[PDB]
């Protein structure tokens, strides 16, 4: 299957064929295909010729064509009347391709030049459930405003989703179809919303009016405010008939007042986005809060008053009325202290599991207040000013197809929250953890203390008040490991991340003690990456009866092993239950044979990539019966073993990309399902016949003489072995040949 990778399932077959440098649509496309993917190519012409009696095709993706306009022939797709989804994004169009099929349910024309939405190109469409027209006249192109001729949509009676964001409309278009469920109009330069704007949209569940009269604060053009920094103006009766509304986005509309009356007839509102407005007032005395007993997510982030740095956050009593609230986002309100009384209104909300107070520059917090909550699972306090526990103004400056407006990535890694209540204190000033640092905290399972300039010597008492932490993140600090009892008070610890604490490890004379590792009975994952460890004090071996994974990259094994009295010859041996080991980025030029033999026999996965090894004693693989993955990418390897099977019976994956292998020997030979030989120095592959699902080869300098026949043969016979990127497997020589994919070859002249 070339050049498109025909993948199968589920209950339909698709031809993955994008980003292959195509100038055209291959005709040689397996019949009876559900849909085709042709995004990210150089195609420039779409025509009747283009799709011939495909018939079967339901979906077509032609986005990003070409990667520098796109020419399309009227009625080009009509030959396909089973076409339901058509994607034409980033194709630089200046009009809605005329003559479009009526079988379309979904049509995307995002990121194009279309400034006129018309009945000729649209109204026929009829079966459209989803229509996307975002990013066409987003000043400038140049483009004054988007023009929608009156009634273009009313004939689309099955229209469930209409997206017109990032287009200058000035006014909401009339004659909208009552079937609408989602209406996106973010950044449409609409300043006034009238009573009649959404008159008959009785089925709306989502309305996005964000970025209209934005609060540009600390941003330049294309961010453009309404004259005099005025907020969007919404009529009192603008939403009286939108009783099905679940999601309302009013982020960055420069609102100062929220009219409670807008919500009288909106009992189902689950999500309300009010980020990037000027609502500190409303937050203190907002009547609109009494109208939302069913709200689950309220985002009030970045509503700070420039230059204001109040002592306390002023949260209205009415917050107590948001009985269905599950998450409250209060980033960037900016205040100095959080007292138990300040959060009174929220202590009764039964479903509140997430409180986000990131970026508030809070100096003090009465932590006992968190114990008075029914369901907190996530306490996000990153980027605050908590100090070790023994003003009047401030200068805070803030600086797709995607959004919601809140960094949709989770607040805490999921591998961490999964264990329980999570507390994030990263990016604070806990440069030293005091004796009462964590007093009065609920039972925390997940804790992040990353990036706090902490240079202390942990001694075994710092976490006595929260001894049930399972996942502890101590990355990016300058901890001084000079006490064997460090962290032993966390008997339940399962994941410990000490990455990026190189500062004391680098200094000669300072002592380093990692003995605490063995004291944990349930420790599973330990990451000591990027610590430049090159010596240990007194106790030279890491040991754990439980540890399963050890990430030791970015340290200095070259020094620990490559020199010495064999002090660290058995450094990892005592990791009796280890299955994964990362030794990348350790500047290894040579591994002592006994050093390698002492790695735990229990290993199933070993990474040694990105070192500088030139030889590898394969024979050593004999002592690793359970070894399934072996990674050696990014080295300087020269030769391969001639008898691989006399050493391994379990190896399944072998990664050797970015090496200096120039000759693949006889064989091999095997449980080996994956082999990566991409980016090496293979001029050609000698016959080497024969159970493997994948073989990577792009990047080698192949010699395209008739010798490329044995191999060329090989592939033809085995379409059962995936060769990702055949397109990139290229001829290095000879010169007429060079640059040509080893399959494009006009072999015939070979006779
Ligand atoms: C210190 O060292 C530790 C340990 O290695 C690092 O933490 C690990 O980080 C790795 C890499 O981020 C994590 O692996 C990732 O896990 C994600 C979540 O997995 C869960 O959910 C999936 C399905 O979503 C299940 O399959 C799975 O069993 C888990 O329940 C995955 O989503 C990630 O995606 C992977 O697969 C996709 C396939 O599409 C690929 O696109 C990705 O590239 C990737 O291969 C990935 O598997 C691992 O969870 C971490 N361990 C822990 C305990 O957190 C630290 O980050 C490191 N510290 C620093 C600073 O580097
Ligand atoms: C204003 O707030 C709005 C209310 O939340 C925001 O609306 C959201 O906008 C985002 C981005 O445009 C949409 O997210 C996308 O959704 C599609 C659809 O995926 C569907 O299928 C997947 C299966 O994989 C499923 O998991 C989803 O739940 C969907 O059913 C995705 O394909 C995209 O990758 C992306 O996630 C939201 O869907 C949309 N919310 C809703 C409820 O429709 C809006 O973005 C905000 N405005 C701005 C300017 O930020
Ligand atoms: C602890 O918080 C830190 C800081 O926010 C997180 O580290 C960042 O992680 C993100 C995404 O993984 C990266 O884009 C940043 O570069 C990281 N910054 C720093 C300072 O390291 C970290 O992921 C958090 N840890 C957990 C377990 O949630
Ligand atoms: C819109 O709201 C007004 C308010 O009186 C009401 O009279 C009208 O019936 C509503 N329209 C629809 C279609 O529900
Ligand atoms: C504890 O929570 C309840 C609300 O559930 C509240 O009445 C009480 O005042 C809180 N305790 C303190 C000390 O704030
Ligand atoms: C909210 O909390 C109540 C009481 O703990 C629980 O019964 C309910 O299921 C929770 N709501 C959701 C949506 O999980
Ligand atoms: C570790 O720290 C504890 C508390 O400071 C201390 O009592 C002990 O002497 C230190 N040294 C060792 C090796 O445990
Ligand atoms: C940790 O293990 C070492 C060596 O077995 C032992 O000396 C020490 O008492 C242990 N520490 C704790 C807190 O259990
Ligand atoms: C070995 O690792 C496995 C997998 O996490 C774990 O279940 C087992 O308890 C570990 N062994 C010991 C001795 O803790």
Swiss-Prot record:
Residues 1-751 are extracellular. Expressed in myeloid dendritic cells, monocytes, and monocyte-derived dendritic cells. It comes from the Eukaryota. LRR repeats lie at residues 82-103, 104-124, 127-149, 158-179, 180-200, 203-224, 244-265, 268-290, 294-316, 324-345, 351-372, 375-390, 419-440, 443-464, 468-488, 492-514, 522-543, 546-567, 577-598, 602-622, 626-647, 650-669, 671-690. It is found in: Endosome membrane. The keyword Cytoplasm does not apply. One of its GO terms (molecular function) is pattern recognition receptor activity. GO terms for cellular component: endolysosome membrane; endoplasmic reticulum membrane; endosome membrane; external side of plasma membrane; Golgi membrane; plasma membrane. Changing residue 509 to D: In IMD98; gain-of-function variant resulting in increased NF-kappa-B activation measured in a reporter assay. It is linked to Immunodeficiency 98 with autoinflammation, X-linked: An X-linked disorder characterized by onset of recurrent infections associated with lymphoproliferation and autoinflammation in the first decade of life. Mostly males are affected; carrier females may have mild symptoms. Features include mouth ulcers, fever, poor early growth, hepatosplenomegaly, lymphadenopathy, polyarthritis, and non-infectious enteritis. Endosomal receptor that plays a key role in innate and adaptive immunity. Controls host immune response against pathogens through recognition of RNA degradation products specific to microorganisms that are initially processed by RNASET2. Recognizes GU-rich single-stranded RNA (GU-rich RNA) derived from SARS-CoV-2, SARS-CoV-1 and HIV-1 viruses. Upon binding to agonists, undergoes dimerization that brings TIR domains from the two molecules into direct contact, leading to the recruitment of TIR-containing downstream adapter MYD88 through homotypic interaction. Homodimer. Interacts with MYD88 via their respective TIR domains. Interacts with UNC93B1. Interacts with BTK. Interacts with SMPDL3B. This is Toll-like receptor 8. The gene is TLR8. The chain holds residues 33 to 823 of 1041 of the full protein.
